[PDB]
């Protein structure tokens, strides 16, 4: 003669990450200082690209 | 880690041309140049032609 059972399960989380890159040039980081800016017209394009 | 790509491309342009011919004879360019006109019917056939 059986008797009903019962069923007791744990599970656990599984850890992982997503990692992009984002590059600049040295001369966009020049730009955006505004650390040899001369206040013309003609660098203000640069700046903008 | 991967980063963003850029292309850039430039193509020119190839040239070509298209040419075909045209003739007339002496006696059509002498009748359409109305030189030699006898002021008669006959020669305003020849000329329509």
Do not use: C, W
């Not at 730009?31 to 800016?37: A, M, R």
């Amino acid at each position: 003669v059986d008797q009903p059972v019962h069923n007791y399960m744990v599970k656990r989380i599984h850890k992982r990450s997503l990692s992009a890159a984002f590059a600049i040039a040295s001369e966009a980081l020049s730009l955006l200082s505004n650390t040899y800016v001369d206040g013309t017209e003609i660098d203000s394009s640069l700046r903008i690209r």
